[PDB]
Amino acid sequence: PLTADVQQKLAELERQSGGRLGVALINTADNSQILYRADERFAMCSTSKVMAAAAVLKKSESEPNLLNQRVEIKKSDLVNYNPIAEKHVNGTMSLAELSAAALQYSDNVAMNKLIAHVGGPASVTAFARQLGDETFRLDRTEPTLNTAIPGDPRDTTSPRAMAQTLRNLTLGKALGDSQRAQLVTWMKGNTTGAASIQAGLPASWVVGDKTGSGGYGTTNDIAVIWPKDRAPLILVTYFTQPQPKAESRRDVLASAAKIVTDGL
Ligand SMILES: *C(=O)C/C=N/[C@H](C(=O)O)C(=O)CCO
């Protein structure tokens, strides 16, 4: 996986941080991968929002507007973490606005609206299947999909599956050129990821990422990364802990990112 003192470094990091670490890096320069527990299941938490927004982008390829469609925001709709959907109670938001809100502020009402709109969690899972992702499963809505209970396969995927899917979505041809560019723009505009993968990368590198967090101190990040003068990287870092109310460890994701981008 590079020696494998990248593997030894990740093993150290995992053990030192006392949780379970999952990493999948794809280097598009030569198609190489660095994998650490990349076939184990992890709770996606808010990183699942990329798949929901992508499912909507894919449907917009056959429903030419779609992104302009308005969605009512109700008082009762508040799950709550929803920093954007609140400024529109008893108003509406477009699907474009809900996508942006879900992806860039991790708005949980926005996620629920995306899920509802494609047909529920099973239809988000079906979109993943149509992409050839056989591992992704979305089972619940916000906020329960973030429980992240050990042994619970609901709302999980593997780092390898999520890295390949994210590659196909942001760089490959899973989406139309227009829709791919929209997804990349949204993720590049993320506001929640400065302390996660980005914290472990040279400051000049451009990152589009989606974080996630949940029970058991689950701390996640999935990213497309353009180091300059370099071919892009896809990096998935998933991290979960054993105590139910463990605190977030976004620094572990930053360290994982440093480790696997070393030599690059
Ligand atoms: C996506 O990762 C955002 C979700 N965070 C969840 C929530 O919906 O409340 C949690 O933080 C659960 C407890 O950490």
CATH number, domain of 206, equals 3.40.710.10
Which residues form ligand 1's pocket by a CB distance below 6 Å? 45-46, 81, 106, 108, 142-143, 146, 212-215
Which sign, positive or negative, has the C-alpha torsion 175, 103, 171, 236? negative
- Specify the 3-state DSSP secondary structure of 219: strand
Sequence-distant (6+) residues with CB within 8 A of 242 are 18, 19, 150, 216
**Is 46 tagged catalytic?**
yes
Q: What is the DSSP letter of 250?
A: H
Of 17, 46, 99, 248, the catalytic one is: 46
Residues 148-169 as b or e (16 or more Cβ within 10 Å = b): beeeeebbbbbbbbbbbbbbbb
Distance from residue 156's CA to the centre of ligand 1 (Å): 14
Distance from residue 147's CA to the centre of ligand 1 (Å): 8
Residues 218, 239: contact at Cβ < 8 Å? yes
Output the residue whose Cα is nearest ligand 1's atom 13: 214
What's the gap between Cα 80 and its chain centre? 19
Distance from residue 214's CA to the centre of ligand 1 (Å): 4
Residues 207, 201: contact at Cβ < 8 Å? yes
Query: How far apart (Å, rounded) are the C-alpha atoms in residues 162 and 167?
Result: 8
Query: How far apart (Å, rounded) are the C-alpha atoms in residues 194 and 232?
Result: 19
Q: Which residue has the tokens 């909507």?
A: 56
From 142, 144, 146, mutation site for ligand 1 pocket: most ligand atoms within 8 A of C-beta: 146
Helices (H), the chain: 5-17, 48-60, 95-105, 108-118, 121-130, 159-170, 177-188, 250-261
Residues 23, 37: contact at Cβ < 8 Å? yes
- Data resolution in angstroms: 1.7
Distance from residue 144's CA to the centre of ligand 1 (Å): 8
Output the residue whose Cα is nearest ligand 1's atom 9: 143
C-alpha distances (whole Å) from 75 to each of 90, 91, 92, 119 are: 7, 10, 12, 22
Number of domains in the chain: 1
Domain that holds residue 194: 5-261
Name residue 72's beta-bridge partners. Answer: 92
Query: How far apart (Å, rounded) are the C-alpha atoms in residues 124 and 128?
Result: 7
Output the residue whose Cα is nearest ligand 1's atom 3: 46
Output the residue whose Cα is nearest ligand 1's atom 6: 214
Residue 204 burial (C-beta neighbours within 10 Å; 0-12, 13-18, 19+): exposed
Q: What is the DSSP letter of 246?
A: P
